[PDB]
């Protein structure tokens, strides 16, 4: 069943620099040795990204807005982050999407889930055999009226408690599809997202077609002999963190190398130099002066001035005339 | 389904024979937009949506691009750039009863027009006047839905018609819904005509040395034209060059 967790330190949210992260392949077309200009929903360069912690005492799994699409990144070594919940009211009154990577299978379902106020998974540590096993799945109370279901091939997670693994995702809800892009890279940082460029390849286009305005991240708890108490307080968490940014209708210049891999990109609305680079369709600019855009002052008010008359037009006497 | 609450069926990963439907004698309306009704079996789509509902005969004309009216505006709206086929038939022997069939509703009032493929199934009281209704119908406060009340003795314009709209999705994505066309052997190093999962053209097919990513289906050159494809059966990457040409 559902249980509310307690014993958490009331800290403020942290923020990080998105740098040049969050760029993905806009389509499924092979291109090489070319600079391609595209307009799509991308994470703006050097944007303000909300930084969530799960360390010990924090276990951040709030419900966040989805807006026009979400950039999600996780940095961890113990696989605390398992999945996400997407939807509107996030309860049994509406269709919602649940994506969870559990110890043996990845499950994607769309149902009228009655999600927990504080949903999570849990792994128990058994000192008797020094093994970690998944024992809890407390995400929802019920899951009726399912319209979509997918389960991946079986596997085994180590689930060992302990940053080594950086996992970046892009979530788009558009044209009847829930599009997921992802990239898995090594990381040696414990403070923030790395500085460098990496393009995210498409993972799956889910033929769902539901309304998503809010989402939350599903984290796994660790329970051991060192965590006495009840299901609400008798827990800890392996060090982990994740970042959430939002996508914007931005124009990007993407650089494809010989192998057709995107190796760089320019955010055309980041600054006047990037704007120049996009204008010239080049990642370099020669000495000189270039016209790249136009300046225009925008209106701040809307002024409507009609004749000050109150009498209504005699249409009714035409429509309800005794004789035509 | 009722037209105000039309039912959408998603069709994918299958062979779509549209000649069975088109050459049928059982349909009174079969109008295709953005596509020829006799070329459908030569095409591949990324998805097909079959939207089914019941309206009365006179309203069948509203199920089209560029139409207005109670159905076009408040129930089922098709986009001006709609690609697909609108199929309808008389169902007076199914959806009508003695005394009137009141199980088929339509939206009569709405604050604004629907967007293309928008489905509004609310029953909130419509405010016609300047005074808030507060959920209570009465003067200038209307219940937004109305029934057709289909009867077997109605004239054709008031008889029920079952409408199925097949919208054809064309994204830059792997096509999953193809007509029943028989494939041929792959021929390389010759000038041939070709059709790769809906992608047609003329040229010479050769083994490609381009390292496509696992998700990429075709490539393009600096002209933004196809210069390579992934064979849908072998997953072999093929380069496409134009057949020898030049001035004389």
């Amino acid at each position, epitope marked *: 069943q559902c249980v509310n967790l307690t014993t958490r330190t009331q800290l403020p949210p942290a923020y990080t620099n998105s740098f040049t992260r969050g760029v993905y392949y806009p389509d499924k077309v092979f291109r090489s040795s070319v600079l391609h200009s595209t307009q799509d929903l991308f994470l703006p360069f050097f944007s303000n990204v909300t930084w969530f912690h799960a360390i010990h005492k924090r276990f951040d799994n709030p419900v966040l807005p989805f807006n026009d699409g979400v950039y999600f990144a996780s940095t961890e070594k113990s696989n605390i982050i398992r999945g996400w919940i997407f939807g509107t009211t996030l309860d049994s009154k509406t269709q919602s999407l649940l994506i969870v990577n559990n110890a043996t299978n990845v499950v994607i379902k769309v149902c009228e889930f009655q999600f927990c106020n504080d949903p999570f998974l849990g792994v128990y540590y058994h000192k008797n055999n020094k093994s970690w096993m998944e024992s809890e799945f407390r995400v929802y109370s019920s899951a009726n009226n399912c319209t979509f279901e997918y389960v991946s091939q079986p596997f085994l997670m180590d689930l060992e408690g302990k940053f080594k693994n950086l996992r970046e995702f892009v979530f788009k809800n558009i044209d009847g599809y829930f599009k997921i892009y992802s990239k898995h890279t090594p990381i040696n940082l414990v403070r923030d997202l790395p500085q460098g460029f990496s393009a995210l390849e498409p993972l799956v286009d889910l033929p769902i077609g539901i309304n998503i305005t809010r989402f939350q991240t599903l984290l796994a708890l660790h329970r051991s002999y060192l965590t006495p108490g009840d299901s609400s307080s008798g827990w800890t968490a392996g060090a982990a963190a994740y970042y959430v940014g939002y996508l914007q209708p931005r124009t990007f210049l993407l650089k494809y190398n010989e192998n057709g891999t995107i190796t760089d990109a320019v955010d055309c609305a980041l600054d006047p130099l990037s704007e120049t680079k996009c204008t010239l369709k080049s990642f370099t600019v020669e000495k000189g002066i270039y016209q790249t855009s136009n300046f225009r002052v925008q209106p701040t008010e809307s002024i409507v001035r009609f004749p000050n008359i109150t009498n209504l037009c005699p249409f009714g006497e035409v*429509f*309800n005339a005794t004789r035509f | 389904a009722s037209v105000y609450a039309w039912n959408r069926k998603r069709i994918s990963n299958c062979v779509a024979d549209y000649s069975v439907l088109y050459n049928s004698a059982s349909f009174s309306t079969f109008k295709c937009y953005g596509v020829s009704p006799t070329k459908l079996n030569d095409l591949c789509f990324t998805n097909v949506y079959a939207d089914s509902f019941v309206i009365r005969g006179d309203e069948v004309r509203q199920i089209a691009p560029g139409q207005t009216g109670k159905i076009a505006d408040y129930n089922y709206k098709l986009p001006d750039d709609f690609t697909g086929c609108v199929i309808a038939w008389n169902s007076n022997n199914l959806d009508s009863k003695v*005394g*009137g069939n*009141y199980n088929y509703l339509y939206r*009569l*009032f709405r604050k604004s027009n629907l967007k293309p493929f928008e489905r509004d199934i609310s*029953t909130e009281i419509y405010q*016609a006047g300047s005074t808030p209704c507060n959920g*209570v*119908e*009465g*003067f*200038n*406060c*209307y*219940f937004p*839905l*109305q*029934s*057709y*009340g289909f009867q077997p003795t109605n004239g054709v314009g008031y008889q029920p018609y079952r409408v199925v709209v097949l919208s054809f999705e064309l994204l830059h994505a792997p096509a999953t819904v193809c007509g029943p066309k028989k494939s041929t052997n792959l021929v390389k190093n010759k000038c041939v005509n070709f059709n790769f999962n809906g992608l047609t053209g003329t040229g010479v097919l050769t083994e490609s040395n381009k390292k496509f990513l696992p998700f990429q289906q075709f490539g393009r050159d600096i002209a933004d034209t196809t210069d390579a494809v992934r064979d849908p059966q072998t997953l072999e990457i093929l380069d496409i060059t134009p057949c020898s040409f030049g001035g004389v």
Partner: nanobody
Amino acid sequence: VQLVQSGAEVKKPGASVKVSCKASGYTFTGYYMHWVRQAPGQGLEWMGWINPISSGTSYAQTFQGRVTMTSDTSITTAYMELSRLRSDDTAVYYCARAAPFYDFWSGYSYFDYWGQGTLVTV
């Protein structure tokens, strides 16, 4: 257009009576169904109406709290149930058809069709 009501009823004070009205010849849900009472030697008194499409109702302050109107579109029949009957509720009850409030030419302002009166004695 026809409106056919149930037969006459005799009830004791404190009892409830349910008078039905079966409609035909028109789209049942396209009109409001009104009930009008006529006590012996008296004129016509409006009681209220029901809108079969939603079963929304409205009642005169005189009957509000005592009368409940319902309908069933599958048999195109309207019902009026008057509870806590008193001796002064002896009257002939009529069902009558009128346009809905959205009728452009104010067909709701009057009753164009009436059923046969049903006498209820209390």
